RNA sequence: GCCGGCUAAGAUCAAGUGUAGUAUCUGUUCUUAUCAGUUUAAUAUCUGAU
C-alpha cells in the first residue's frame, strides 16, 4: 500500500535528496484489521526521474505520516511517533514516543 | 454478583482514575471506559455528600463581590468608556473543567 | 453520644487497611482518608511500592504487588529508543544498542 | 413513536446506547455529503453501493443479539 | 462558629398556620443491641427471628 510520502535530506548522509514513502500491508478497514507497514527509502535517482530502492524498514503498524524533524524522518505509526535516521539496511529508531491518543494521522515541522 | 474493586480495577487499562463507589454500578467496564475520556470533566464532589456543599461551611467570611478595577478604575464622557472599555483587565479564571467543589476557594 | 448522628455521618463502620499496617479505620469518610495519610504512606513505603495515585482505592497485598508490577514502566517510554547501528560494517547491522556500538567503537 | 426515540434513560444498557449511536450516526452518513463522498473514496465504491451497504447495516449493527 | 470536642452536622411521627405553588412553627423518638430477606452507588429504611 501507500499512505505518505516525503522528500528530505539527512544530516548523517550528504546533500543527496532522499525520498521516503509509506506502505501498508493488509490494512483491511471495516473492520479495521491491518497486518503491517513499511517505509521505502529511495535515493531519488536520475536527478528526479528515478528512485533507488534503498531500504524497506518494517513496522507493526500502518504508517500515516513522515516529515524532516530537524534532519530526521518523523514517522507516526499507529499511536507512536518515532524519529528515524539514515539506515543502510533499515530506518534506525533514533527516538520514539508512544503517547499518541488513538492514531497519528499527521505531523507538522515547526 | 459483580466484579470486585480489584478485579474491576485491574481488568481496566487505566485504574488511575478508578473509584470505589463506581465499581458497584450496572456496567463497571462501561463506566471505566467513559471515565477514560481524553480531556472530559468528571462528576462534581457533591455526588455522595449530604451537606449540599453549603451547610458545612455556612459561616462565609469574605466580601460579597469586590468591585473590579476594569470598570471602576452625566457619569463620564471621555473617561467612562475610556476606563471600562479601554483600560479593562481580563478576568483570569479556570479554563475548561474546574468544576466547583464545596469550598473550591479556600483551598 | 449522638447515635443518630453516628448512623447518619457513617459511624459504626470500619475499613481494614492491610498495606497501612493492617490498621482499622472508620467508615467511608475515613475509608478514602485512610488511603491518603501518614500511616498508610509509611506502610506503602515500607512495603516497597511507590505511593501512586492509581493505588489509592487499593487495599490488599497481592493486589498491591500486581498493581506495582503491571502499572510499572511498561513498553511506553523505553530506554530512549536505542538504535546505534555502528560503522563496523557500514552496510549491514544496526541492532547494536547505545552500549553495544560504544563498546564496538571504543576498542 | 416519536416521543423520545434516539436516547434511553436512567438505566439504559451500553449496548442499547451504542445501537442508537450507530443508527443515528449512519443517517448523518446517508444524508450528509462530505461524509458520504469521503467513504466512497476509501472503500472505492459508488454512492449507491455505499448507501445500500449503510442502509442494510441499520438492521442490527454494533453486534446484535438477534 | 470557638479554642479533637463541647450532641446547632442528618432522618422521621402528631398537631397548628397558609399558598396557585414552595412552604413556616411547636412537641417527640432516634435504633446505644444481633442475625436473615428487600433495597440503597454504599448507608438508611422496611419486612421476620432472637
From Swiss-Prot, chain A:
Chain's gene name: SF3B3
Location relative to the cell: Nucleus
Similarity field: Belongs to the RSE1 family.
Positions marked as site (Interaction with SF3B1): 102
Subunit text: Component of the 17S U2 SnRNP complex, a ribonucleoprotein complex that contains small nuclear RNA (snRNA) U2 and a number of specific proteins. Part of the SF3B subcomplex of the 17S U2 SnRNP complex. SF3B associates with the splicing subcomplex SF3A and a 12S RNA unit to form the U2 small nuclear ribonucleoproteins complex (U2 snRNP). Within the SF3B subcomplex, interacts directly with SF3B1 (via HEAT domain), SF3B5 and PHF5A. Identified in the spliceosome A complex; remains associated with the spliceosome throughout the splicing process. Component of the spliceosome B complex.
Site, as annotated: Interaction with SF3B5: 30
Protein's name in the database: Splicing factor 3B subunit 3
Function: Component of the 17S U2 SnRNP complex of the spliceosome, a large ribonucleoprotein complex that removes introns from transcribed pre-mRNAs. The 17S U2 SnRNP complex (1) directly participates in early spliceosome assembly and (2) mediates recognition of the intron branch site during pre-mRNA splicing by promoting the selection of the pre-mRNA branch-site adenosine, the nucleophile for the first step of splicing.
Comment on protein domains: The core of the protein consists of three beta-propeller domains.
From Swiss-Prot, chain B:
Modified residues (Symmetric dimethylarginine): 51
Cross-link (Glycyl lysine isopeptide (Lys-Gly) (interchain with G-Cter in SUMO2)): 35
PTM comment text: Methylation at Arg-51 by PRMT9 is required for the interaction with SMN1.
Intracellular or extracellular location(s): Nucleus; Nucleus speckle
Outcome following mutation: residue 38 to K: Does not affect methylation by PRMT9
Effect of residue 51 to K: Abolishes interaction with SMN1; Abolishes methylation by PRMT9. Abolishes formation of omega-N monomethylarginine and formation of symmetrical dimethylarginine
Omega-N-methylarginine modified-residue sites: 51, 58
Effect of residue 73 to K: Does not affect methylation by PRMT9
Impact after mutating residue 49 to A: Does not affect methylation by PRMT9
Function: Component of the 17S U2 SnRNP complex of the spliceosome, a large ribonucleoprotein complex that removes introns from transcribed pre-mRNAs. The 17S U2 SnRNP complex (1) directly participates in early spliceosome assembly and (2) mediates recognition of the intron branch site during pre-mRNA splicing by promoting the selection of the pre-mRNA branch-site adenosine, the nucleophile for the first step of splicing.
The protein's name: Splicing factor 3B subunit 2
Organism encoding this protein: Homo sapiens (Human)
Phylogenetic classification of the source organism: Eukaryota, Metazoa, Chordata, Craniata, Vertebrata
From Swiss-Prot, chain C:
Keywords annotated in UniProt: Acetylation, Metal-binding, mRNA processing, mRNA splicing, Nucleus, Phosphoprotein, Spliceosome, Zinc, Zinc-finger
Primary localization: nucleus
Zinc finger (Matrin-type): 15-46
Domain of life: Eukaryota
Positions of post-translational Phosphothreonine modification: 84
GO biological process, one term: mRNA 3'-splice site recognition
GO molecular-function term, one example from the UniProt record: RNA binding
Record carries keyword Transcription: no
Localization terms from the record: Nucleus speckle; Nucleus
Annotated tissue distribution: Ubiquitous.
Gene Ontology CC terms: catalytic step 2 spliceosome; nuclear speck; nucleoplasm; nucleus; spliceosomal complex; U2 snRNP; U2-type precatalytic spliceosome; U2-type spliceosomal complex
Record family assignment: Belongs to the SF3A3 family.
Role played: Component of the 17S U2 SnRNP complex of the spliceosome, a large ribonucleoprotein complex that removes introns from transcribed pre-mRNAs. The 17S U2 SnRNP complex (1) directly participates in early spliceosome assembly and (2) mediates recognition of the intron branch site during pre-mRNA splicing by promoting the selection of the pre-mRNA branch-site adenosine, the nucleophile for the first step of splicing.
Name used for this protein in its record: Splicing factor 3A subunit 3
Species this protein is from: Homo sapiens
Stretch of the intact protein here: 392 to 498 of 501
Curated annotation (Swiss-Prot), chain D:
Region ranges (Interaction with SF3B1 and SF3B3): 1-62
Site residues by UniProt (Interaction with RNA): 6
Keyword Lipoprotein: no
Keywords: Acetylation, mRNA processing, mRNA splicing, Nucleus, Phosphoprotein, RNA-binding, Spliceosome
Residue positions where N6-acetyllysine is found in the record: 3
UniProt GO MF annotations: RNA binding; splicing factor binding
DNA-binding found in the keyword field: no
Function: Component of the 17S U2 SnRNP complex of the spliceosome, a large ribonucleoprotein complex that removes introns from transcribed pre-mRNAs. The 17S U2 SnRNP complex (1) directly participates in early spliceosome assembly and (2) mediates recognition of the intron branch site during pre-mRNA splicing by promoting the selection of the pre-mRNA branch-site adenosine, the nucleophile for the first step of splicing.
The family this protein is said to belong to: Belongs to the SF3B5 family.
Name this protein carries in UniProt: Splicing factor 3B subunit 5
Origin species: Homo sapiens
Lineage: Eukaryota, Metazoa, Chordata, Craniata, Vertebrata
First and last residues shown, out of full length: 15 to 80 of 86
Amino acid at each position: 500500500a501507500a499512505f505518505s510520502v516525503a522528500v528530505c535530506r539527512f544530516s548523517n548522509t550528504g546533500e543527496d535528496w532522499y525520498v521516503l514513502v509509506g506502505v501498508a500491508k493488509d490494512l483491511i478497514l471495516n473492520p479495521r484489521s491491518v497486518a503491517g507497514g513499511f517505509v521505502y527509502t529511495y535515493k531519488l535517482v536520475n536527478n528526479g526521474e528515478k528512485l533507488e530502492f534503498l531500504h524497506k524498514t518494517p513496522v507493526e503498524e500502518v504508517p500515516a505520516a513522515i516529515a524532516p524533524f530537524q534532519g530526521r524522518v518523523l514517522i507516526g505509526v499507529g499511536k507512536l511517533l518515532r524519529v528515524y535516521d539514515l539506515g543502510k539496511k533499515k530506518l534506525l529508531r533514533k527516538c520514539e514516543n508512544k503517547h499518541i491518543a488513538n492514531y497519528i494521522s499527521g505531523i507538522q515541522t515547526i | 454478583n459483580r466484579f470486585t474493586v480489584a478485579e474491576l480495577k485491574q481488568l481496566v487499562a487505566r485504574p488511575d482514575v478508578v473509584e470505589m463507589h463506581d465499581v458497584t454500578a450496572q456496567d463497571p467496564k462501561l463506566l471505566v471506559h467513559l471515565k477514560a475520556t481524553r480531556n472530559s470533566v468528571p462528576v462534581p464532589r457533591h455526588w455522595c455528600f449530604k451537606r449540599k456543599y453549603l451547610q458545612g461551611k455556612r459561616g462565609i467570611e469574605k466580601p460579597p463581590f469586590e468591585l473590579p478595577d476594569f470598570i471602576k478604575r452625566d457619569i463620564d464622557y471621555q473617561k467612562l468608556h475610556d476606563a471600562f472599555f479601554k483600560w479593562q483587565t481580563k478576568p483570569k479564571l479556570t479554563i475548561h473543567g474546574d468544576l466547583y467543589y464545596e469550598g473550591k476557594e479556600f483551598e | 453520644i449522638p447515635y443518630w448522628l453516628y448512623k447518619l455521618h457513617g459511624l459504626n463502620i470500619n475499613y481494614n487497611c492491610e498495606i497501612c499496617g493492617n490498621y482499622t479505620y472508620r467508615g467511608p469518610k475515613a475509608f478514602q482518608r485512610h488511603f491518603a495519610e501518614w500511616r498508610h504512606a509509611h506502610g506503602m513505603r515500607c512495603l516497597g511500592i511507590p505511593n501512586t495515585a492509581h493505588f489509592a482505592n487499593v487495599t490488599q497485598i497481592e493486589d498491591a504487588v500486581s498493581l506495582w508490577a503491571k502499572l510499572k514502566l511498561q513498553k511506553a517510554s523505553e530506554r530512549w529508543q536505542p538504535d546505534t547501528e555502528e560503522e563496523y560494517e557500514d552496510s549491514s547491522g544496526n541492532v547494536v544498542n547505545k552500549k553495544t556500538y560504544e563498546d564496538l567503537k571504543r576498542q | 413513536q416519536s416521543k423520545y426515540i434516539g436516547t434511553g434513560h436512567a438505566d439504559t444498557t451500553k449496548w442499547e446506547w451504542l445501537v442508537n449511536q450507530h443508527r443515528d450516526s449512519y443517517c448523518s452518513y446517508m444524508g450528509h455529503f462530505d461524509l458520504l463522498n469521503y467513504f466512497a473514496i476509501a472503500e472505492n465504491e459508488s454512492k449507491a453501493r455505499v448507501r445500500f451497504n449503510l442502509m442494510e447495516k441499520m438492521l442490527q449493527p454494533c453486534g446484535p443479539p438477534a
